[PDB]
Amino acid sequence: EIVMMQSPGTLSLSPGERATLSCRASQSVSSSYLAWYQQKPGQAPRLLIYGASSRATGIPDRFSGSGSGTDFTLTISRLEPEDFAVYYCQQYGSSAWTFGQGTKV
Amino acid sequence: EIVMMQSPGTLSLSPGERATLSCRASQSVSSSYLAWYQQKPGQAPRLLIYGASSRATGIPDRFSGSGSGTDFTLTISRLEPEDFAVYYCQQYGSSAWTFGQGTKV
Amino acid sequence: VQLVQSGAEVKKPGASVKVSCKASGYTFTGYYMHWVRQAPGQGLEWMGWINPISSGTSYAQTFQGRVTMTSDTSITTAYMELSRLRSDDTAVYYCARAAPFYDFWSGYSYFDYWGQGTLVTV
Amino acid sequence: VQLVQSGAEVKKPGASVKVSCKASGYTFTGYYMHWVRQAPGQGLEWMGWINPISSGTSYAQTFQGRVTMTSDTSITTAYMELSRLRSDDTAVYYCARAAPFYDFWSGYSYFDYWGQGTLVTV
Amino acid sequence: CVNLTTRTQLPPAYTNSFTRGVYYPDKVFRSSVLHSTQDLFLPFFSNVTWFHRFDNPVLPFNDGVYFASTEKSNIIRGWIFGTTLDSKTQSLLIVNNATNVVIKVCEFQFCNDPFLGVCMESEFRVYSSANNCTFEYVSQPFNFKNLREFVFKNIDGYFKIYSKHTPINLVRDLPQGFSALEPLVDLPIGINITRFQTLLAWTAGAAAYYVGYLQPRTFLLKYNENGTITDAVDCALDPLSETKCTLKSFTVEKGIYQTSNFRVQPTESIVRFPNITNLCPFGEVFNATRF
Amino acid sequence: ASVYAWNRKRISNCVADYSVLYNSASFSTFKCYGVSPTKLNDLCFTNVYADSFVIRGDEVRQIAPGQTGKIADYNYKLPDDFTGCVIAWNSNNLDSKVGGNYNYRYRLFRKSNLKPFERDISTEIYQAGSTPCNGVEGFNCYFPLQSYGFQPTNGVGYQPYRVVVLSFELLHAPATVCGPKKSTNLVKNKCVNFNFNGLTGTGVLTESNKKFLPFQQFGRDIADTTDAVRDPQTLEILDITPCSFGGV
Amino acid sequence: DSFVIRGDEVRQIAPGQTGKIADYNYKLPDDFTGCVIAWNSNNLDSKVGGNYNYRYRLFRKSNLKPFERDISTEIYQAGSTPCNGVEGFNCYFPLQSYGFQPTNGVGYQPYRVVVLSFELLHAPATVCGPKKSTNLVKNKCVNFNFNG
Ligand SMILES: *[C@@H]1O[C@H](CO[C@@H]2O[C@@H](C)[C@@H](O)[C@@H](O)[C@@H]2O)[C@@H](O[C@@H]2O[C@H](CO)[C@@H](O[C@@H]3O[C@H](CO)[C@@H](O)[C@H](O)[C@@H]3O)[C@H](O)[C@H]2NC(C)=O)[C@H](O)[C@H]1NC(C)=O
Ligand SMILES: *[C@@H]1O[C@H](CO)[C@@H](O[C@@H]2O[C@H](CO)[C@@H](O)[C@H](O)[C@H]2NC(C)=O)[C@H](O)[C@H]1NC(C)=O
Ligand SMILES: *[C@@H]1O[C@H](CO)[C@@H](O[C@@H]2O[C@H](CO)[C@@H](O)[C@H](O)[C@H]2NC(C)=O)[C@H](O)[C@H]1NC(C)=O
Ligand SMILES: *[C@@H]1O[C@H](CO)[C@@H](O)[C@H](O)[C@H]1NC(C)=O
Ligand SMILES: *[C@@H]1O[C@H](CO)[C@@H](O)[C@H](O)[C@H]1NC(C)=O
Ligand SMILES: *[C@@H]1O[C@H](CO)[C@@H](O)[C@H](O)[C@H]1NC(C)=O
Ligand SMILES: *[C@@H]1O[C@H](CO)[C@@H](O)[C@H](O)[C@H]1NC(C)=O
Ligand SMILES: *[C@@H]1O[C@H](CO)[C@@H](O)[C@H](O)[C@H]1NC(C)=O
């Protein structure tokens, strides 16, 4: 199957700065099937980005996504204390949904 | 006028069991004009069954009714502590609404 | 849908009592308002009804000539006026909603919403 | 849209566990229910889905033959039954809402609502 | 159910329909007139399948069927109409028993060899399970001696039964001549009918039956003074019949008449489009992030 | 019934009082096609098909001739020459449940459109692409039926509406369903306006010498116009002649 | 012509329509010339408990001919039994109120409707649009407009 690899494994930064996380895939991925999720510690994951670049309903404009092929990125324009959570990339292909390993912020 | 007679006058049973109450009429009654009401102690009566067999909105599926002619019944599939109340049968005919004497559960 | 009635009243024999029933959550004029009496330890007795749209009434023969039922659409409230009280009239009085007689399904044969009872002691 | 799951369960190896997910705020049969497993310190793993309209299912190859997914439209609730438990299955189990495969836009590729996780210890 | 196996296996026989199969197409009285009607009729001089023994498999039912029986001792019992005949679909059962005719449109689980037995009637082995009844009707009953003709149509929610009873005197054939079948009953039953089977009433009796098929045809019907149909012209049988229909008469004078139009019909469908494979960017319009 | 598996109650051999249904207040939609609603009690039909189902409020407009969508093209298609009335009413107080009533279903997918009055109750997986599905739900392989999640808090367009359609069949056959009209005495040898089992006209009724067959209800002349009728109460054959006329 | 109706009934204010407002309250002729202007008036006509001043006729023995007002309150006889003025079984009160509430859905909010019927018969015209007149020119080919 496809291997989903995120980078960096751990991110370290200060509130107020910009962050960029990347998601790589073994095989080419249609932009329509890529999504990003935020999981705060002790809480269930919640959807942030779907369709590679579209924001989910209720999500602040600080979150944006981009990418194509095998290379996708998630960018946070400015971080608040609530943003220091684990971010996951997810993809659909074949008849299965594959998640990445997760990145800690 | 029509005499409305319920039976038994008092019912005694345990939680978790099934109950059947009956309502008899002096004269034949159309199924469309028969209804059942539940009155809990200290509370106003509330509608349970109308049109002989139709459940009122918001009523659990544990309550069911049946009957025709002069013989109607109300069945509770399983009783909960809230179900130990007074049940009434009501009928419309002529230009009047007649209630039964009530059965205690 | 809600039907909020006035508080309990205590009256002497021969007096008259008025019980208000305020309706909310539905078109008040679209339904008939009925009154039901429940003497302590006894069953329910139908007293009559009022059609708010035309202020038309009908009363049970037991109470015919003794009770007047009225309504005020402006404040969405129905009223009961029971005259010539006797000791046998101590009871809890409920207001109830029934569909009109025009209803294709027999919605007038049963009461789908009830207010909290008003205790009247005589 | 709310998804409310049952409380935590503790099971012995070889047993089976059932985790409910009650849905509200949307048409239950109009969406697929997916299950996602998260072992402590690990990422998310997809287990399968249930289509409430037809009780159709699909399972990940990792769990094929071990897990059964069911639903009850009457109470708007999905169920997970995981059999043949081993110590490696201790994890937080999430239920997730996704669009059906007939959505013109790829709404089936992502999960838009998640319930609170149920902790299962083996 | 009982499976009868002591039966000789011979191929189906065939015969000539002659001028049989004409029925009153409507419920309106007309007399001393020639009426042109477009309806489902048995074509003149058509090839009719002929069955005898205990010969009764399931046959196709297309636009409608023509059924005829030659009997001397009341062997015929009825018909089954349906799509699958095994309780999965709705079916129509028509049975003429010893005391009356019963029509039921219940869901029946039929036998794979249904029949009745008989002299007094005893065995009834037509079906097992029977529930989800939707329609019932009961009515008056119905060399060889008795010829019975029936027309069965399934149009616009009605199953139309037409029938005629006549004497016969042949040993091994269908009579030549003309008669019209009066309507017997119009059943308001919306059934998908594609197959049917004949019920017959161990030993074999003396009986034969014929099955033909209806086609869309125009017929010129001759009504006499009493409004009885006494003749007919099948307007596509031959060039003379077409001429008779065109002139609205059963008598044609000497001359030349223009009666129809010849046209060669196409046998193939030739479809040519540009050999392009790229798909139109409709998706890009519908799934754009900003409208 | 669900719209995909709608119920049909054939109505025959009875008196149909349509004033009760039309003058009722309980109905929101009452649209008639092919007949007017206020002339229904003066008509006779051979057969009435009472069709009944539950649909979504926005789909109430689809129960009409010449409509397109999901209920028309896939659940309850009406013919363009439909004669009948589409009576419909809001049933939120009967069909809604808090968590959603998922008993009412509709067909969402199908290979082709439903011909008029064609019921389809299958659950065969719909193939959206070029790849065979082989009975397995997945990509481009859908489940054809879907439920309406009827909730009391839904908007009006999403509340359940119960629909009863009444198809009036008019073919040249005996009429069995007639309105609540009173019959009058038969008058012969005079110019009258007559109505014989829905057949109306003006003429002079005389005793006929025509030999009608037991199944024939009326007759026609060489001109293919009505010239004789069988009385619906006594099986007498009457001749109809036009009332006297001529040039002046 | 001016009145208040329910939003779902706005479609009935047209030629060739059926229902309760068309067949019993405001019937328009099929050869109607005019404009049916309507607007949502929830901010003017709604009250919390319901504004019960706006009424409509629900019952009537026959349909209203075009532009026929009917302001009676005679009890409607639904059955075969005479009512004799008494409300009861098969005897209804013909008028009903709209319970206009600010929390109602759009189809149940009040709409104020103004209909404008333009009469065209061979008679002097008295209502004209805001057109400017020009000087009269004689003995030349011109395009003219004389009072419509
Ligand atoms: C926005 O939509 C376009 C086009 O949408 C396509 O056509 C519509 C009518 C619907 O049928 C859509 O479901 C359909 O996707 C999307 O572009 C197309 O996406 C598909 C899905 O991945 C691509 O198909 C794949 O192509 C690769 C080859 O690169 C194959 O290996 C795969 O097996 C599969 O066939 C298709 O090529 C692609 N076309 C183009 C021109 O890009 C687009 O992805 C979508 N975007 C978003 C954000 O929704
Ligand atoms: C009569 O013959 C038919 C076959 O022509 C029998 O039908 C089969 O019955 C067996 C049960 O023993 C099934 O396993 C087969 O699937 C059936 N085949 C078909 C095509 O239906 C039938 O059972 C026989 N009847 C009796 C009474 O023996
Ligand atoms: C012929 O068919 C009719 C119709 O089914 C049979 O009549 C029924 O017979 C059963 C059997 O006793 C009775 O229970 C029903 O009440 C009868 N119905 C009617 C309407 O008569 C009849 O018995 C059949 N005759 C034979 C000889 O089988
Ligand atoms: C009827 O068709 C069969 C099949 O081709 C043929 O063998 C038979 O001769 C035909 N009968 C007549 C009378 O043409
Ligand atoms: C009758 O038909 C229904 C299909 O709507 C089916 O559910 C039922 O099982 C049938 N009855 C019997 C006795 O099989
Ligand atoms: C009747 O059933 C057959 C299946 O054997 C089907 O192909 C056909 O379309 C059906 N016809 C109608 C009118 O439903
Ligand atoms: C018409 O019927 C009469 C008997 O009613 C009969 O004498 C006469 O021959 C018939 N006419 C024809 C053409 O058959
Ligand atoms: C009513 O009609 C039937 C039709 O068959 C007829 O037999 C019967 O005599 C009629 N009765 C009266 C009173 O007209």
Author numbering:
A (entry chain D), B (entry chain L): 1 to 105
C (entry chain H), D (entry chain C): 2 to 123
E (entry chain E): 15 to 66, 78 to 143, 152 to 175, 185 to 243, 258 to 347
F (entry chain B): 348 to 595
G (entry chain A): 398 to 545
What does the study report here?
To compare the structural basis for the effect of L452R on S2M11 and ab6, we performed cryo-EM studies on the Epsilon-S2M11 complex. We obtained a global 3D reconstruction of the Epsilon spike bound to three S2M11 Fabs at 2.16 Å. In contrast to the Epsilon-ab6 structure wherein R452 protrudes into the antibody interface, R452 extends away from the S2M11 interface. As the L452 sidechain is accommodated within the footprint of S2M11, this positioning of R452 is likely due to steric clashing and charge repulsion effects which may increase the interaction energy and underlie the observed attenuation of potency.
SARS-CoV-2 utilizes a trimeric spike glycoprotein for attachment to the host cell receptor angiotensin-converting enzyme 2 (ACE2) and for the subsequent cell entry step which involves the fusion of host cell and viral membranes. All emerging variants contain defining mutations within their spike proteins, with multiple mutations clustering within the receptor-binding domain (RBD) impacting both ACE2 binding and antibody neutralization escape, while mutations within the highly antigenic loops in the N-terminal domain (NTD) across these variants reduce antibody neutralization. Given the rapidly changing mutational and antigenic landscape of the SARS-CoV-2 spike protein, a structural understanding of spike protein mutational effects and the discovery of broadly neutralizing epitopes is of importance.
